[PDB]
Amino acid sequence: MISSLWIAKTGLDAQQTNMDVIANNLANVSTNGFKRQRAVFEDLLYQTIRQPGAQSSEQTTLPSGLQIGTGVRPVATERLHSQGNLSQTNNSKDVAIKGQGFFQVMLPDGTSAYTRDGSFQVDQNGQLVTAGGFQVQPAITIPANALSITIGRDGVVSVTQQGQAAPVQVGQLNLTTFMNDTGLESIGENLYIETQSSGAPNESTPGLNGAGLLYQGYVETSNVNVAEELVNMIQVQRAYEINSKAVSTTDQMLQKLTQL
Amino acid sequence: MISSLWIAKTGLDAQQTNMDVIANNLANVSTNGFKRQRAVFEDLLYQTIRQPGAQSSEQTTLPSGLQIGTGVRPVATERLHSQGNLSQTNNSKDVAIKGQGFFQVMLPDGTSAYTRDGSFQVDQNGQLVTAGGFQVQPAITIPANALSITIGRDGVVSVTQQGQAAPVQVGQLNLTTFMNDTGLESIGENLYIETQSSGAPNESTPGLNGAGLLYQGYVETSNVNVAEELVNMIQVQRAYEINSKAVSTTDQMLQKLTQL
Amino acid sequence: VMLPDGTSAYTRDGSFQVDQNGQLVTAGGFQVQPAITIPANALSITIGRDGVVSVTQQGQAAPVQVGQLNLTTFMNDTGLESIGENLYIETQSSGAPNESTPGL
Amino acid sequence: MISSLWIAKTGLDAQQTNMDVIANNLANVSTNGFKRQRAVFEDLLYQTIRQPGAQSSEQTTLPSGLQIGTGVRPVATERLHSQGNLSQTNNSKDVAIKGQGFFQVMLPDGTSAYTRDGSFQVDQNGQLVTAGGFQVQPAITIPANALSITIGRDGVVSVTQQGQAAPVQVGQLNLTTFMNDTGLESIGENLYIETQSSGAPNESTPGLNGAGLLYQGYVETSNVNVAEELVNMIQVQRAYEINSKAVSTTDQMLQKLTQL
Amino acid sequence: NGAGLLYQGYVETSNVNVAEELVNMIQVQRAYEINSKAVSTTDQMLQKLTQL
Amino acid sequence: MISSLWIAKTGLDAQQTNMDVIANNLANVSTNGFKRQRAVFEDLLYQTIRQP
């Protein structure tokens, strides 16, 4: 029931949130197209007993007042929208985007979400859907009897057929770019939905207006650096132990006070 | 216990599944007509403590909120129906299928399954049967006084007979195609059965509708590569060992918190 | 916070819940005076530092404003008479409460 | 004699039972045809001081009443009737069953029991008995001068003899399944008996009516995964520590009360 | 209509934060001890008064 | 003196018997006309709290 105890509780909770985000970053180290997160902490208010700059006398002004902090709180968990390393998989329907942008996906309830994990497949109706059953927005259809599917540098998906002697331009595969990519609200299954912090998307073809380029046969791995999470965990453990020590010291102080 | 512990447990489970699929791909490297497996991961939901784009004031809005992941989940582990290299066995009853297609066989209970591993024997009744005691759906029956069996580019099976000095068309060897070959489920002895994920089986003759050709005396080997399997094994081992560190750190933090 | 008797008491403890009709009430059933109402199927409700309250709904991106949360200031809060259940009522020893937006 | 103390005692008992089931799963990790168990927990009754939704005044209704929990009690231990990993031993009489269903045996007193572990032997008279002397229900008898006995994919069992050429069939290994296999009451030596929760057993040949298949020379190992048992033990130990700390705090406060 | 989704093969665990429970227990124990000391002080005061 | 301890003791004894069988089989690998051993286990009794 003491200010020191409450400050230490806030510190413990902040360290717990830091450890949680580190564990989440480590867990999906092998998730294609994953972007890591880091949490920023901002301290709480200050109780002022003696106001700084107080007019202590007719001329004397206090160089600094008496202020006591009230703890620390987590304010945001920002995503680091960096570029992950590309890999080789030698697959017809594995597309990795380089640069900036997002594929559009039509959710079952009629809304539109945005994704980054490009690993496509075909359903029983020929539609080009992602892993999870959600289909793309431009509604790309792959006819039967097809031999191979080629996606160029830009989104001109073409199908090599048996008796046409030339590929057929099935459709166009654009992507949407935001000006506040870190502001997107994330949901499960590697889908981002547009929010107010993120601006209105402006869909464009690859290679224009700063948009990225599509590559076939590549998969964008998670941009998680394992070599730094170990150091982060060590620092987190030390901070948690220190705060627990502070709590124990406060409790012992109170016990010695009340044993009289 | 704690969210960090649960996240690390989910990560451990995902890495264990990845290791298992790698081991299964590596074990049956020499199985003829084997398509390797690849597992795709996907992150779970997110707890939104602070909503992104929150309206803190009438003019200022939060650029990024507070979201904590709930771990990772294995969405699917699917088989890569790529093309495998061929080898010569100089066997009259061995056929290898090039391109896209599936032989059809009939299980004893009545249902029909689809295979890629072409290695046919003959039962005591003269009926064409694959390795495992399963007959081909067209039910080709090789008669007696058979000298040599010829299987051309298409599905024509003929036998050179000493009598009548003329080959006789024993039967036709059709094959089927699925517009979604990925969705086929897998059972033992190199069998696949139709599911709702895959379309209706479009049956045809070789060389038409995009179906692949047939080669006499060849066999389609597995599409596994030990060189990439080993490096993937190293990756998964390091990822699992890193994930275990999060569990250990959480346990130590809980112990220190308890020992106050 | 408005009592059943109709008098507007003033409280400091913030622990608010939502009753069946979607109104924002404190623990005890007493309702806040600006009469903040929360619609059904609300995903997340966020209260800004300025004083506004917004509700997020599935389907649309722009948050919908549901009400404004002003608060009162007294010239002498010591003279407020403390009735039970964490309520202070205005007396003659305290100046007339003035309502204002938070932070101003 | 305090509600907190009784709640903590119930929590300790629940954690003890969880540790017991974990240790039981770990102990018989090398038992053929064994299924893991998992406990399910529910909270006890809540004693209500003020009824939720109470009509506080003519208009005011309490948003949430005052309720105090009583604790947690275990409800059931579900057996995960998954598919065990198949091993190989190259034995004539070791038979594994893939899928569903159980072999039916007769207990000495006359009742009928069911088992999943297939590891058969032969008694003096030549009757096929399990490991323990119990004989299978169809009463399969192995004749003398038996060179080798074979069990096909279905339930047909034959044996070759020197004096003939075509093997002579002996019996049929029909297996029975249940509507709900989770509700089987288990007893020692891998035997399950029919109960009210489990439906009426229905017999069928292997490979029909959703039943499994018989593989000769294989034994179905237990489906116990040692990977997560360690983390379960860590979690249960920490939970026991937390509840013990709760008891300690209650004792400390009660002693400080009665000290005066 | 803002309803949840269904996932198969998973179970929703209890959302109990163990970290805060220990410090809450410490607070509860200290508050209980302080109130007990207040009761003892009142008892001592009454005992001194009664033997007047 | 607890159920988990007794279950773990039984498990340890089973593993020790399995190891002894393996060691004995490996010891005489060059013995003419020798047959390997194989130990089979089965779960012990069950104590019921709520009847299935």
Provide a short characterization of the protein structure.
Chain E: It comes from Salmonella typhimurium (strain LT2 / SGSC1412 / ATCC 700720). With 260 residues, chain A is of the alpha+beta class.
Structure characterization notes:
- The structure is cut from a larger assembly and holds six copies of chain A.
- With 260 residues, chain A is an alpha+beta fold.
- Helix content of chain A is 22%, strand content 31%.
- Chain A has two helices and 20 strands.
- A five-stranded antiparallel beta sheet of chain A has the order 11-7-8-17-16, with no helix packed on it. In chain A, strands 12-13-14 form a three-stranded antiparallel beta sheet, with no helix packed on it. Chain A has a two-stranded antiparallel sheet with strand order 1-4.
- In chain A, a hairpin with a 5-residue loop joins strand 9 (120-122) and strand 10.
- In chain A, helix 1 packs antiparallel against helix 2 (226-258).
- The longest helix of chain A is centred in the last third of the chain and has 33 residues, at 226-258.
- The two termini of chain A are 19 Å apart.
- Chains A, B, D: One of its GO terms (biological process) is bacterial-type flagellum-dependent swarming motility.
- Chains A, B, D: It is found in: Bacterial flagellum basal body.
- Chains A, B, D: Its main location: other.
- Chains A, B, D: Keywords: Bacterial flagellum.
- Chains A, B, D: It holds the Pfam family LlgE_F_G_D1.
